[PDB]
Assembly symmetry: D2
């Protein structure tokens, strides 16, 4: 029997494992270390989770390795691997109300949105990649012949081996799903550091793999400190690929950790400060509604959030005036109310960091139209914020706030290259939008945006089949899509003479 | 006018440029520093070559930037870009006796060989990758439509931009070509740091790009030090991809450097203690001749050289008795004589380490069948070496010689799983091979060998179209082949709603 | 509510629908016409099946048309489409025993093999292609720009639309699944003529598509005669693609009809006289077992069946002596019994054909070493046959038997080139194989063989991810693999200028 | 030495061969027959060209057959076959003035434009496919392993063998090139029937292969009658692929011929009544210039020409008004004079149909805005014609003009679905186009147009890398693009077990 933290809430009776997941069992940490996970809706302790120690990493990696080298996962057909990864999705469906609720407590996600996006996309991801298994192909190549003999060259795509996946707190299960699916589909096995503050969905997922008959020790999950658990993963000489999603500063440290250990492969999806340019000739009402989502989605905690909205001179004051009308209607409150539009922030820390961010923007001149402060009420809620009169040199114009904060800069009518320019003025390069009814501006601003993803007359429409990565300092590699896979496969050329 | 360094040799008149090639003109380095390049056939100073400084990297990098961002290379058609790259091929072809010589002279490549391989394969690289120019395609993906609307998702394959290429000395021009061609074909501008000790053929190529009509600033060559020029490239906040081929130790360092500045893309292609398994049932004549080749080609100064030979017991003795016979037939001598077929080592530095290598080899009680000394003549000649009785734990079964030192071990008659286990016991995995007539043995071995290439009844069968790379700590990323372009490309995802 | 011919057998209760399936429901044919389907084991009547009429092919085709044009099937995201195709696979699994049981009864397929291949490989198909749904991808081509302007060129893969699938009697459900999967996965809609003589699995599967949620009229099955109902599909001006699998002289007639009606795409999987060449250097025990499989598999009613065994002289007599031994052991009898390995032939008609094929084989002087007669038991049982001293000119050497008749020819010890030649000497080109332990002989033979599959050291190993097609008068196009989708897609090029 | 018909024009000495090209040499017809090819600028007999007879096809085929099976074409590297075609591209470029001249003489193509397009794109086409030669890769596929053993599945792409090409008269050289290039590049050898009326550029190319070193037999050109030389190709037992571009009527016929012959692979590029929908919010002035070229380009002898111009109401009057002012500015006249916009039609018989077309036009109720008559000057010039008030039942809405005949219909304001549906109301579907400034329209429409190409805000913007092909009765299969290779390759699946 797996040990649960049992909690009756939201018409369910949650059974949450709270332990380490190493080789198929749920165990205590070395020395039975533990920490609390905080419910950000009221700031209470949810329960206590195992605190993975360095020994524990080594143990996890050793399980995964064995499980890849001699374990069932390594021997089965590509096709049958898919079968399991579909089952895995399937189980995840059958538990979705649960998973979403957990996520609702643990990360403060709105339970309706947790359902559709956090859990939904998750379920979707596994299904997608599941499909890619008997479809990962190599080539035969027309190598010059070494006459009077013949030659055949072929490639094989092989797994890379033991992987470490290290992820942040904004969409706990979702992130975990994105990479792990790609990882497991490519035939690898894995140790997962979920963000320390958000362990619960990750662990429940652990259990689910069991129910899916994921072979013992292909998946391993270790709640715990990045500085320690995550650090070992990168240093460990038996792991051979890191998948990372996190802050720029750590990503830099990670890549470094990888080079100094054993030149492991590494993928980075770091920050964004993505510009959304809204033209006067767009659909002004859809632009307020799309562009609010481009900031407020998942309480702002989001990689592709629009860091800046650039708005044609002619439509600006009316766009703002409209956004404030809409913002006043946004329902703040507990994630478990079907009611709620806007939930609480992920953990205290980040609310305090959001508080200062906004102090600071006001300090340096920008106009604070609304919000910019904690919502006074228990738990850690933050008022949707709108800044205007934001200028290119400002902190708030350069820095990734990662919270419900609209940053609006006007762009003078009928230059394009001149705003394009200001939008590519960052070292971030992850996402970007353009709203216009004009085909030419769209197609053009779409080449010129120095960013991995360009939304056109929409926002936040990632999909599990379209590749997702960064340029410049947003990192490299892709998540989701056929091209998320090359991160987790390797290519062997085989040359015969005959 | 260009400053040449004329030299009458091999029935030709070399005119060898010898300065930094920045901004598409040849220039002196900061404050006119220079250094000597040495002929490894008589230890003489060939001529003086410019010593690029930090101030010079900075210009070269910012000359490549301008050349991408505002220059003609940034705007011509993709089909037209590749047209320029083919031109370059035939310019290089028309300079093939001249180029095979500068190589013979500068890196001690046997002349017939430089012509065929150093320079000939360099030519085919460019023809090959100019072909890919307008065949680099993106995709359109069947994204989930956001009813009641529609979406369109596509990927554009864009250039990365300003690239650093840092190469070694063993095939000065070919390693330059393999990497440059891909990069330039994907549409990038480059700064190239050749191996300090082999700046000649790179500089000539520098001239030849002017001849082709490559726009000024696309191609930039800085002869100099790895610890100064090399390092600045990887630190530069404006370089975005570092392609690298060299030592494991240096490799590890580059990645860390890349990590630390601006998360720049990196592809390492490092050492290789590559195993060749020879079963009782191959053509034993071919086995020898081919296995010889797998060690002695280009004075064994070759990333993929068979680092070990494992010869099945039943034929071990007779294979060694055959290899020796063949080694004696080898004519050692000056790269430019027609009758020569084993030239000198690249430079003093290295010939010294090779000496030390076999020393240690004998110290550890592996038995020396022949060679292992510096041939007594002037220059840097190393004698074709054979070891036998090399046990797995020994130094000379672990580190990389990169000199013509055939290193032979026994495996027991009708083992397979064990020889393999032995052959894979290295932290390298770049190349490997197996001679055998048993389709089953053949295909299984090539499954199981933990290495980027597996030759099968052949060796040193690289082809511009077959991807060349490393697993484990031999690195990551591919050179040559379609898959190479991946390292010089980025994917932008465009998601339209409508 | 549906009408079933209900039958208690094989530890279950068959409930087979016996009607045309048209646009959602099961209806009787024009003025209630019907025919008999004959159980091949005892010769009995299984039941009455509706006999579709020209009037009905029209009913069906236009059902499919609506279903494609404003019907739900062509609106659902590509991904949800795969979901339905996956659910249909789950349902087929759920009903697998029933389905094999009908297949056994209807086509006389040994029930163990039917489970694994007929039903098994069918269930595998619909899953394999279900996965391809949201991974069918277009491209962005980097087209020459029309300076001073800019262009973008993309492709979209799209459905061809209403399709006709016309299939034979040897693997009724399987032939249907192979093609229908592909068809449905590319998002078409479809009318199907199963072979008149075997309509039953076909119609069951229709019921199954209802269980699945496949929407009304996406699939329609019309049991009926080729020369009426099929001739109609191939003439119909609203069908835009035909996938045929059948005889040659009928293949030709279809293409001819497709030309004349509306230049509808056609794809043909026709005859075979597939050569299998057996060298003395193989595992000769594994070669009788693999080589009787090549002919006998599913009673020799099997397009890639080895129509012709060339056996190297030195092992010829011992190969025959051994087959003969293994042929005695084969248990002939009721498909539904556990111990039976050789089933009855599909229908009375085809049986007489084989009796005569073998008469005619003796007449020209081939040496009936065993078999050639019908088995003295009720129903339609045919003696596994073996012929030797069979010459390149003989009828049985040239013509396609489609039955359990191994046709053995000697070739000369040493020859490779001269046998290869007599095995390519055919206007057929569907399969071929080679047994040999020698990697050289093996790759070289598979180059030189003129056929769309070459089996090396194995045979009859088809699989859903690997494409299956003919060369020469065996036809063209692919069944299975990613490449069968190309026949069920079209390509629109979109070039913008902007 | 080759006989020419030498002629001095355009400050040039054309040497034009006029004989059958068969087996790498220029030879006479059987019993030396010939016929006259007729300059359309004035009507003069340009010269007597050879008239290929049936035994002349048997020879051409059998040449290409030897040339493929034993010839150098299929023993050389894929990389070298490539070289040979790049070289041929340069021989074309060196001869481009002459070739563009011959074209303007033989098929009356404005020389200004013959150079840039007829010849320029031919030259680009050979350089395109040349670079595809060594990049036609196969696959390795994750086959289900037959445990306890193992399996390996690869695909080789091989050439199809001897092909026939049959072309129309409108871009004699460019068509020959679109096809011949991709065919030869796929590794095939060919027999090409130029349109009877235009042998001249095809024969010079025939000679040009000789200069370029194309192995004797690889390219065979035979001018003659469609129903004699044409037919015998499509009938011949040794031809395996027929690539054809022409009338739908002939197309149906050729398909049927391939059917009765030997199920030779075919690929039709038939007619087209290509619709162009021009919204009211487009750039008006540009839409004119574009829209006019949509029809008038290359005297309208271009199969993707807009055969229908739906012009939104609010602007239809102003548009016709503008289109007229610009027609007046076009200069009719000798193709050879630099100042000429609109040259003659290809031959008498076509001009006669053109006159009858607009005869039937005015007759039915069309408003003839301008033109519709043969220009009064010698030769075959046809006045650029505009009609309006063209209703949907009119014969000029349904048939293919293939001349300079703009055919304009009104549509209601803001009324997309309706005009769409009008535009799709054809059995053709070769091209379409939309001029609009609004992205949602532009994209929507390009979904819904039932055609193989959709130009958006441009037209006649084909490109050697973008695939070109028709839907419905405009045929199937693509020319140009990677796409195009699929027509000239076969896929061999090779499945090992080991
Ligand atoms: N979609 C596309 O790729 C393109 C299509 N086209 C189409 O081409 C057409 C113009 O050609 P048009 O001359 O009117 O008609 P055709 O189709 O008859 O002309 C094409 C060719 O067919 C030949 N031919 C006639 N009968 C046979 C036969 N039995 N077997 C083999 N070949 C035969 C003709 O020979 P002969 O010289 O004796 O007539 C000619 O070479 C237009 O309808 C246009 O739409 C044009 C360009 C591109």
């Amino acid at each position: 029997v797996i040990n649960y933290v049992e909690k009756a809430v939201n018409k369910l009776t949650l059974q949450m494992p709270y332990q380490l997941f190493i080789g198929g069992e749920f165990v205590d940490a070395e020395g039975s270390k533990t920490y609390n996970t905080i419910n950000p809706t009221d700031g209470s302790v949810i329960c206590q989770v195992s605190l993975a120690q360095v020994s524990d990493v080594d143990k996890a990696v050793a399980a995964a390795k064995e499980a890849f080298e001699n374990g069932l996962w390594g021997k089965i057909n590509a096709r049958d691997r898919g079968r399991l990864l579909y089952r895995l999705a399937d189980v995840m469906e059958q538990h979705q109300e649960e998973l979403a609720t957990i996520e609702a407590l643990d990360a403060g996600a709105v339970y309706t949105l947790a359902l559709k996006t956090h859990v939904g996309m998750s379920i979707q991801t596994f299904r997608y990649f599941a499909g890619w298994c008997d479809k990962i192909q190599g080539a035969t190549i027309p190598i010059n012949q070494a006459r009077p003999n013949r030659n055949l060259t072929l490639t094989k795509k092989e797994p890379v081996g033991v992987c470490g996946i290290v992820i942040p707190w904004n969409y706990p299960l979702m992130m975990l799903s994105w990479k792990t699916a790609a990882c497991l589909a490519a035939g690898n096995t894995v140790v997962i550091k979920p963000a320390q503050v958000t362990p619960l969905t990750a662990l429940k997922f652990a259990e689910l793999t069991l129910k899916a008959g994921i072979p013992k020790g292909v998946v391993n999950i270790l709640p715990g400190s990045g500085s320690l658990v995550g650090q070992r993963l990168s240093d460990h000489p038996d792991v051979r690929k890191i998948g990372f999603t996190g802050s720029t500063e750590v990503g830099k440290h990670i890549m470094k950790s990888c080079a100094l250990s054993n030149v492991k492969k590494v993928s980075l999806e770091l920050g964004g400060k993505s510009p959304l340019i809204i033209f006067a000739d767009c659909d002004l009402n859809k632009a307020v509604q799309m562009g609010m989502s481009s900031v407020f989605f998942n309480k702002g905690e989001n990689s592709i959030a629009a860091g800046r909205l650039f708005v044609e001179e002619s439509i600006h004051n009316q766009f703002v005036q409209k956004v404030v009308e809409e913002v006043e209607k946004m329902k703040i409150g507990n994630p478990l109310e079907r009611d709620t539009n806007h939930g609480p922030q992920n953990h205290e820390a980040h609310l305090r960091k959001l508080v200062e961010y906004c102090q600071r923007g006001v300090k340096e001149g920008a106009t604070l139209v609304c919000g910019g402060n904690q919502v006074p009420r228990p738990g850690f809620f933050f008022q949707p914020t709108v800044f205007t009169d934001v200028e290119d040199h400002m902190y708030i114009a350069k820095e990734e706030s990662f919270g419900p904060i609209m940053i609006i800069s006007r762009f003078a009518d009928g230059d394009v290259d001149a705003v394009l320019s200001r939008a590519n003025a960052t070292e971030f390069g992850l996402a970007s939008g353009v709203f216009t009814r004009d085909i030419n501006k769209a197609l053009y601003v779409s080449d010129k945006l120095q960013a991995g993803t360009v939304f056109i007359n929409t926002y936040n429409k990632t999909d599990v089949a379209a590749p997702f990565g960064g340029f410049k300092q947003s990192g490299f590699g892709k998540d989701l899509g056929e091209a998320a896979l090359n991160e987790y496969l390797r290519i062997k050329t085989v040359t015969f003479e005959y």
